[PDB]
Amino acid sequence: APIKGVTFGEDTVWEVQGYKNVRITFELDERVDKVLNEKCSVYTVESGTEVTEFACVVAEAVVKTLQPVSDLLTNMGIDLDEWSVATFYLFDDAGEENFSSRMYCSFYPPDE
């Protein structure tokens, strides 16, 4: 119930609270995949936000959340330092840049 500062029972949720709920479950890793999908893949979306704004708030935690043994990732090919400076294209269930209840995390661009 992500309600504003001082507010409660004003009319309904997802209308006044000015927030939402979105999850990520597409593809990123092979060993530490659940670390960013199960450990914490849920995030809140304000009222006025862009699909690109979440690419800086969602990918963030994905870093500190997946920093168990970067020494290995870098040895396999997966860079942890790049994740913080990489592009996060949030896709939908239709194949577009949407931020619905569930948005996929694709590395490749939309089409541009």
GROMACS .gro file of N, CA and C in nm:
model
  336
    1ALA      N    1   0.082  -0.120   0.000
    1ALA     CA    2   0.000   0.000   0.000
    1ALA      C    3   0.086   0.126   0.000
    2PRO      N    4   0.154   0.151  -0.113
    2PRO     CA    5   0.241   0.268  -0.128
    2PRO      C    6   0.163   0.398  -0.135
    3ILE      N    7   0.108   0.440  -0.021
    3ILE     CA    8   0.031   0.563  -0.014
    3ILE      C    9   0.122   0.684   0.008
    4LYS      N   10   0.073   0.802  -0.030
    4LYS     CA   11   0.149   0.925  -0.014
    4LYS      C   12   0.186   0.948   0.132
    5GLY      N   13   0.241   1.066   0.161
    5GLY     CA   14   0.279   1.098   0.297
    5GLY      C   15   0.169   1.068   0.397
    6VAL      N   16   0.074   1.160   0.409
    6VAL     CA   17  -0.037   1.143   0.502
    6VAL      C   18  -0.169   1.126   0.428
    7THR      N   19  -0.205   1.001   0.400
    7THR     CA   20  -0.328   0.970   0.329
    7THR      C   21  -0.370   0.825   0.351
    8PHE      N   22  -0.500   0.801   0.350
    8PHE     CA   23  -0.553   0.666   0.369
    8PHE      C   24  -0.705   0.664   0.350
    9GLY      N   25  -0.753   0.565   0.276
    9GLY     CA   26  -0.896   0.553   0.252
    9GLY      C   27  -0.956   0.682   0.200
   10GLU      N   28  -0.908   0.728   0.085
   10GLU     CA   29  -0.958   0.851   0.025
   10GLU      C   30  -1.056   0.821  -0.088
   11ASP      N   31  -1.036   0.707  -0.154
   11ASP     CA   32  -1.123   0.666  -0.264
   11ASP      C   33  -1.092   0.524  -0.307
   12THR      N   34  -0.966   0.499  -0.340
   12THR     CA   35  -0.923   0.367  -0.384
   12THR      C   36  -0.772   0.362  -0.407
   13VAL      N   37  -0.719   0.242  -0.427
   13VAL     CA   38  -0.576   0.224  -0.450
   13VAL      C   39  -0.544   0.226  -0.599
   14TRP      N   40  -0.416   0.245  -0.631
   14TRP     CA   41  -0.372   0.249  -0.770
   14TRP      C   42  -0.436   0.366  -0.844
   15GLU      N   43  -0.490   0.461  -0.768
   15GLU     CA   44  -0.555   0.578  -0.827
   15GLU      C   45  -0.512   0.706  -0.755
   16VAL      N   46  -0.504   0.698  -0.623
   16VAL     CA   47  -0.465   0.813  -0.542
   16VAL      C   48  -0.323   0.796  -0.487
   17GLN      N   49  -0.288   0.672  -0.453
   17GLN     CA   50  -0.156   0.643  -0.400
   17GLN      C   51  -0.047   0.698  -0.491
   18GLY      N   52  -0.076   0.705  -0.620
   18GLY     CA   53   0.021   0.756  -0.716
   18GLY      C   54   0.139   0.663  -0.733
   19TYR      N   55   0.113   0.533  -0.736
   19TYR     CA   56   0.219   0.434  -0.752
   19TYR      C   57   0.164   0.306  -0.814
   20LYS      N   58   0.254   0.213  -0.844
   20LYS     CA   59   0.215   0.085  -0.904
   20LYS      C   60   0.313  -0.025  -0.865
   21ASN      N   61   0.293  -0.144  -0.921
   21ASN     CA   62   0.380  -0.257  -0.893
   21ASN      C   63   0.417  -0.331  -1.021
   22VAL      N   64   0.547  -0.350  -1.042
   22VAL     CA   65   0.595  -0.420  -1.161
   22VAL      C   66   0.706  -0.519  -1.125
   23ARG      N   67   0.712  -0.629  -1.199
   23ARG     CA   68   0.813  -0.731  -1.175
   23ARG      C   69   0.892  -0.760  -1.303
   24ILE      N   70   1.010  -0.820  -1.287
   24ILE     CA   71   1.095  -0.853  -1.400
   24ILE      C   72   1.129  -1.002  -1.402
   25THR      N   73   1.109  -1.065  -1.517
   25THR     CA   74   1.138  -1.207  -1.531
   25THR      C   75   1.152  -1.246  -1.678
   26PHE      N   76   1.265  -1.210  -1.738
   26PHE     CA   77   1.291  -1.241  -1.878
   26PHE      C   78   1.417  -1.325  -1.893
   27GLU      N   79   1.532  -1.260  -1.883
   27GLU     CA   80   1.660  -1.329  -1.896
   27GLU      C   81   1.777  -1.232  -1.873
   28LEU      N   82   1.874  -1.276  -1.793
   28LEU     CA   83   1.990  -1.193  -1.763
   28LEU      C   84   2.114  -1.280  -1.740
   29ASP      N   85   2.103  -1.373  -1.646
   29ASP     CA   86   2.214  -1.463  -1.615
   29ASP      C   87   2.169  -1.609  -1.621
   30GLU      N   88   2.258  -1.699  -1.581
   30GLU     CA   89   2.228  -1.842  -1.582
   30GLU      C   90   2.237  -1.901  -1.442
   31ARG      N   91   2.332  -1.851  -1.364
   31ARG     CA   92   2.352  -1.900  -1.227
   31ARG      C   93   2.285  -1.806  -1.127
   32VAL      N   94   2.308  -1.676  -1.144
   32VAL     CA   95   2.250  -1.576  -1.055
   32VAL      C   96   2.127  -1.511  -1.117
   33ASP      N   97   2.046  -1.591  -1.184
   33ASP     CA   98   1.925  -1.541  -1.249
   33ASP      C   99   1.815  -1.516  -1.146
   34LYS      N  100   1.801  -1.608  -1.052
   34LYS     CA  101   1.699  -1.597  -0.947
   34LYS      C  102   1.738  -1.489  -0.846
   35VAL      N  103   1.864  -1.447  -0.850
   35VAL     CA  104   1.913  -1.344  -0.759
   35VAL      C  105   1.856  -1.207  -0.795
   36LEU      N  106   1.809  -1.194  -0.918
   36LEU     CA  107   1.752  -1.068  -0.965
   36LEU      C  108   1.607  -1.087  -1.008
   37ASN      N  109   1.555  -1.208  -0.991
   37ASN     CA  110   1.418  -1.239  -1.028
   37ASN      C  111   1.338  -1.285  -0.906
   38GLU      N  112   1.406  -1.349  -0.812
   38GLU     CA  113   1.341  -1.399  -0.691
   38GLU      C  114   1.386  -1.319  -0.569
   39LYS      N  115   1.516  -1.293  -0.561
   39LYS     CA  116   1.572  -1.218  -0.449
   39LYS      C  117   1.503  -1.083  -0.434
   40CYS      N  118   1.476  -1.018  -0.546
   40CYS     CA  119   1.410  -0.888  -0.545
   40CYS      C  120   1.391  -0.836  -0.687
   41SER      N  121   1.281  -0.875  -0.750
   41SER     CA  122   1.252  -0.832  -0.887
   41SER      C  123   1.130  -0.740  -0.890
   42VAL      N  124   1.072  -0.716  -0.773
   42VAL     CA  125   0.955  -0.629  -0.762
   42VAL      C  126   0.996  -0.484  -0.737
   43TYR      N  127   0.931  -0.392  -0.808
   43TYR     CA  128   0.961  -0.250  -0.794
   43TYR      C  129   0.834  -0.167  -0.806
   44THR      N  130   0.837  -0.047  -0.748
   44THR     CA  131   0.723   0.043  -0.752
   44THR      C  132   0.738   0.148  -0.862
   45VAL      N  133   0.628   0.180  -0.928
   45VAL     CA  134   0.629   0.279  -1.036
   45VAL      C  135   0.539   0.397  -1.003
   46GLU      N  136   0.598   0.515  -0.994
   46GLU     CA  137   0.523   0.636  -0.963
   46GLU      C  138   0.414   0.661  -1.067
   47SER      N  139   0.346   0.775  -1.056
   47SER     CA  140   0.240   0.810  -1.149
   47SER      C  141   0.297   0.860  -1.281
   48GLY      N  142   0.380   0.964  -1.273
   48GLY     CA  143   0.440   1.020  -1.392
   48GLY      C  144   0.585   0.979  -1.409
   49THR      N  145   0.607   0.867  -1.478
   49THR     CA  146   0.742   0.817  -1.500
   49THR      C  147   0.756   0.760  -1.641
   50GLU      N  148   0.881   0.743  -1.685
   50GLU     CA  149   0.908   0.690  -1.818
   50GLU      C  150   0.964   0.548  -1.809
   51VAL      N  151   0.951   0.473  -1.918
   51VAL     CA  152   1.001   0.336  -1.923
   51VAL      C  153   1.152   0.332  -1.911
   52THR      N  154   1.216   0.447  -1.930
   52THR     CA  155   1.361   0.457  -1.922
   52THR      C  156   1.406   0.492  -1.780
   53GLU      N  157   1.316   0.554  -1.704
   53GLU     CA  158   1.347   0.592  -1.567
   53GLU      C  159   1.366   0.469  -1.479
   54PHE      N  160   1.293   0.363  -1.510
   54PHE     CA  161   1.302   0.239  -1.434
   54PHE      C  162   1.431   0.164  -1.467
   55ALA      N  163   1.491   0.197  -1.581
   55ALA     CA  164   1.615   0.133  -1.624
   55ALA      C  165   1.733   0.180  -1.540
   56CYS      N  166   1.709   0.280  -1.456
   56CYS     CA  167   1.814   0.334  -1.370
   56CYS      C  168   1.784   0.304  -1.223
   57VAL      N  169   1.661   0.264  -1.195
   57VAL     CA  170   1.620   0.232  -1.059
   57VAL      C  171   1.607   0.082  -1.039
   58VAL      N  172   1.584   0.010  -1.149
   58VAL     CA  173   1.570  -0.135  -1.143
   58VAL      C  174   1.705  -0.204  -1.160
   59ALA      N  175   1.784  -0.154  -1.254
   59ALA     CA  176   1.916  -0.211  -1.280
   59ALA      C  177   2.012  -0.183  -1.165
   60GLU      N  178   1.983  -0.078  -1.088
   60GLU     CA  179   2.066  -0.041  -0.975
   60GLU      C  180   2.077  -0.155  -0.875
   61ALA      N  181   1.965  -0.186  -0.809
   61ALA     CA  182   1.962  -0.294  -0.711
   61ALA      C  183   2.017  -0.424  -0.770
   62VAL      N  184   1.992  -0.445  -0.898
   62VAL     CA  185   2.039  -0.565  -0.966
   62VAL      C  186   2.190  -0.580  -0.953
   63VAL      N  187   2.258  -0.469  -0.929
   63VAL     CA  188   2.403  -0.469  -0.914
   63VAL      C  189   2.444  -0.518  -0.775
   64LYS      N  190   2.413  -0.438  -0.674
   64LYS     CA  191   2.445  -0.472  -0.536
   64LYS      C  192   2.385  -0.607  -0.498
   65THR      N  193   2.275  -0.643  -0.564
   65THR     CA  194   2.208  -0.769  -0.537
   65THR      C  195   2.284  -0.887  -0.599
   66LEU      N  196   2.361  -0.858  -0.703
   66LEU     CA  197   2.439  -0.961  -0.770
   66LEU      C  198   2.589  -0.930  -0.763
   67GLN      N  199   2.639  -0.915  -0.641
   67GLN     CA  200   2.781  -0.885  -0.620
   67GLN      C  201   2.843  -0.984  -0.523
   68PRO      N  202   2.800  -1.110  -0.531
   68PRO     CA  203   2.851  -1.217  -0.444
   68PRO      C  204   2.995  -1.254  -0.476
   69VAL      N  205   3.023  -1.276  -0.605
   69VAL     CA  206   3.157  -1.312  -0.648
   69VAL      C  207   3.181  -1.269  -0.793
   70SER      N  208   3.188  -1.138  -0.815
   70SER     CA  209   3.210  -1.084  -0.948
   70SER      C  210   3.335  -1.144  -1.011
   71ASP      N  211   3.429  -1.184  -0.927
   71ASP     CA  212   3.554  -1.243  -0.974
   71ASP      C  213   3.527  -1.359  -1.069
   72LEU      N  214   3.412  -1.423  -1.052
   72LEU     CA  215   3.374  -1.536  -1.136
   72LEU      C  216   3.304  -1.488  -1.263
   73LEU      N  217   3.208  -1.398  -1.247
   73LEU     CA  218   3.134  -1.344  -1.360
   73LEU      C  219   3.229  -1.291  -1.467
   74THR      N  220   3.325  -1.210  -1.425
   74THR     CA  221   3.423  -1.153  -1.517
   74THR      C  222   3.505  -1.262  -1.585
   75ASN      N  223   3.514  -1.378  -1.520
   75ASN     CA  224   3.589  -1.490  -1.575
   75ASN      C  225   3.505  -1.569  -1.675
   76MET      N  226   3.373  -1.559  -1.660
   76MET     CA  227   3.281  -1.629  -1.749
   76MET      C  228   3.241  -1.541  -1.867
   77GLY      N  229   3.248  -1.409  -1.846
   77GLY     CA  230   3.212  -1.316  -1.952
   77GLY      C  231   3.113  -1.211  -1.905
   78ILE      N  232   3.049  -1.238  -1.792
   78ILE     CA  233   2.951  -1.145  -1.736
   78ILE      C  234   3.019  -1.037  -1.652
   79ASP      N  235   3.010  -0.913  -1.699
   79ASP     CA  236   3.070  -0.800  -1.628
   79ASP      C  237   2.970  -0.736  -1.533
   80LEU      N  238   3.013  -0.708  -1.411
   80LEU     CA  239   2.927  -0.646  -1.311
   80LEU      C  240   2.937  -0.494  -1.317
   81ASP      N  241   3.053  -0.445  -1.359
   81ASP     CA  242   3.075  -0.301  -1.369
   81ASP      C  243   2.999  -0.243  -1.488
   82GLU      N  244   2.970  -0.328  -1.586
   82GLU     CA  245   2.898  -0.285  -1.705
   82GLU      C  246   2.748  -0.275  -1.678
   83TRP      N  247   2.699  -0.360  -1.588
   83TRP     CA  248   2.558  -0.361  -1.553
   83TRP      C  249   2.512  -0.223  -1.506
   84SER      N  250   2.599  -0.155  -1.431
   84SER     CA  251   2.567  -0.022  -1.380
   84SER      C  252   2.573   0.082  -1.492
   85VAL      N  253   2.650   0.052  -1.596
   85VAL     CA  254   2.664   0.143  -1.709
   85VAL      C  255   2.615   0.078  -1.838
   86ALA      N  256   2.506   0.003  -1.828
   86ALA     CA  257   2.448  -0.065  -1.943
   86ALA      C  258   2.306  -0.017  -1.969
   87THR      N  259   2.250  -0.058  -2.083
   87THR     CA  260   2.114  -0.020  -2.120
   87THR      C  261   2.013  -0.127  -2.078
   88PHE      N  262   1.903  -0.083  -2.017
   88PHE     CA  263   1.799  -0.175  -1.973
   88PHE      C  264   1.667  -0.145  -2.042
   89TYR      N  265   1.640  -0.216  -2.151
   89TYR     CA  266   1.517  -0.196  -2.226
   89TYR      C  267   1.403  -0.280  -2.168
   90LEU      N  268   1.311  -0.214  -2.099
   90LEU     CA  269   1.198  -0.283  -2.038
   90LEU      C  270   1.089  -0.310  -2.141
   91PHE      N  271   1.068  -0.437  -2.173
   91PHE     CA  272   0.967  -0.476  -2.270
   91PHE      C  273   0.841  -0.527  -2.200
   92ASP      N  274   0.737  -0.552  -2.279
   92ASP     CA  275   0.611  -0.601  -2.224
   92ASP      C  276   0.580  -0.741  -2.277
   93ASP      N  277   0.455  -0.784  -2.258
   93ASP     CA  278   0.413  -0.916  -2.304
   93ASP      C  279   0.373  -0.912  -2.451
   94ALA      N  280   0.377  -0.793  -2.510
   94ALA     CA  281   0.342  -0.776  -2.650
   94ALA      C  282   0.465  -0.749  -2.736
   95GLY      N  283   0.573  -0.706  -2.671
   95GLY     CA  284   0.696  -0.677  -2.742
   95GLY      C  285   0.721  -0.528  -2.757
   96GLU      N  286   0.666  -0.450  -2.665
   96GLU     CA  287   0.683  -0.305  -2.668
   96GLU      C  288   0.740  -0.254  -2.536
   97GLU      N  289   0.774  -0.125  -2.533
   97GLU     CA  290   0.830  -0.064  -2.413
   97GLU      C  291   0.719  -0.018  -2.319
   98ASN      N  292   0.666  -0.112  -2.241
   98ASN     CA  293   0.559  -0.081  -2.146
   98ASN      C  294   0.600  -0.117  -2.004
   99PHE      N  295   0.534  -0.056  -1.906
   99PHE     CA  296   0.564  -0.082  -1.766
   99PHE      C  297   0.441  -0.135  -1.693
  100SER      N  298   0.388  -0.247  -1.742
  100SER     CA  299   0.270  -0.308  -1.682
  100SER      C  300   0.307  -0.387  -1.557
  101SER      N  301   0.212  -0.465  -1.506
  101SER     CA  302   0.234  -0.545  -1.387
  101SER      C  303   0.360  -0.629  -1.401
  102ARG      N  304   0.394  -0.665  -1.525
  102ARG     CA  305   0.512  -0.746  -1.552
  102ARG      C  306   0.582  -0.698  -1.679
  103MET      N  307   0.709  -0.659  -1.664
  103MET     CA  308   0.787  -0.611  -1.777
  103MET      C  309   0.917  -0.690  -1.791
  104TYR      N  310   0.947  -0.734  -1.912
  104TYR     CA  311   1.068  -0.811  -1.938
  104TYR      C  312   1.190  -0.719  -1.948
  105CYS      N  313   1.307  -0.775  -1.920
  105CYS     CA  314   1.431  -0.698  -1.926
  105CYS      C  315   1.519  -0.745  -2.042
  106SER      N  316   1.510  -0.673  -2.153
  106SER     CA  317   1.588  -0.707  -2.272
  106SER      C  318   1.707  -0.613  -2.288
  107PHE      N  319   1.821  -0.668  -2.328
  107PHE     CA  320   1.942  -0.589  -2.347
  107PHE      C  321   1.939  -0.517  -2.482
  108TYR      N  322   1.885  -0.585  -2.583
  108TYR     CA  323   1.877  -0.528  -2.717
  108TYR      C  324   1.775  -0.414  -2.722
  109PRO      N  325   1.794  -0.321  -2.817
  109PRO     CA  326   1.706  -0.206  -2.834
  109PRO      C  327   1.568  -0.246  -2.888
  110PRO      N  328   1.473  -0.152  -2.882
  110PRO     CA  329   1.336  -0.175  -2.930
  110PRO      C  330   1.329  -0.188  -3.082
  111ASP      N  331   1.392  -0.094  -3.151
  111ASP     CA  332   1.393  -0.095  -3.297
  111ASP      C  333   1.472   0.023  -3.352
  112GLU      N  334   1.465   0.136  -3.282
  112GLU     CA  335   1.536   0.256  -3.323
  112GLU      C  336   1.683   0.227  -3.350
   0.00000   0.00000   0.00000
